[PDB]
Amino acid sequence: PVGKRLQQELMTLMMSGDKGISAFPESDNLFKWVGTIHGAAGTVYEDLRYKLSLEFPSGYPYNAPTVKFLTPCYHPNVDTQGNISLDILKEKWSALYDVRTILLSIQSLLGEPNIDSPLNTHAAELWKNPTAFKKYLQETYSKQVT
Structure with a gap:
């Protein structure tokens, strides 16, 4: 039933x-x-x-899937390993969430960080100055395509 549900989740996403x-x-x-x-x-x-x-462990959907960035991401809530600090992926994970919900939640996190509990302190600090943030973001991103 787990493999079936994942196939259904892919179709929903599509x-x-x-x-x-x-x-x-x-x-x-x-x-x-x-x-x-x-x-x-x-x-x-x-x-x-x-x-x-996105990796779905044997305990899924009771246990949350492991989700990490593969592309380097400079952001208050992402660390050097691509780990993500997002409540729904940890303490607030619900077996009723689908892949679409997870992706949308992470897309939303990009634009609305939780700067109160950061993983990237420097980014959390620079976030207060958008122009300055945008600049460092583009600079760093740029060094991710050459």
Whole structure:
């Protein structure tokens, strides 16, 4: 029933047509997916894109999947390993959330960080100055495509 649910979740994702979100399982393993997120329009992450891995452990859906950024991401709530501090992925994970909900939540986090409990203190600090933030973000992102 778990593999079935994941297939149904992929179909839901495909027919929803949400902008800037995309993900599929690897051909040999339905329990490991790779996804892509684009920053939401109007945010400093607009026009930038990031790849993420999604792994569904044996305890899923009771236990949350492990989600990490594969593309380096400079952001208050992401660390050097691509780990993400997002409540719904940890303490507030619910077995009723689908892949679409997770992707949308992470896309939303890009534009609205939790700067009170950061993983990247420097980014949390610079966030107060958007122009300055945008600049460092683009600079750092830029060094991720050459």
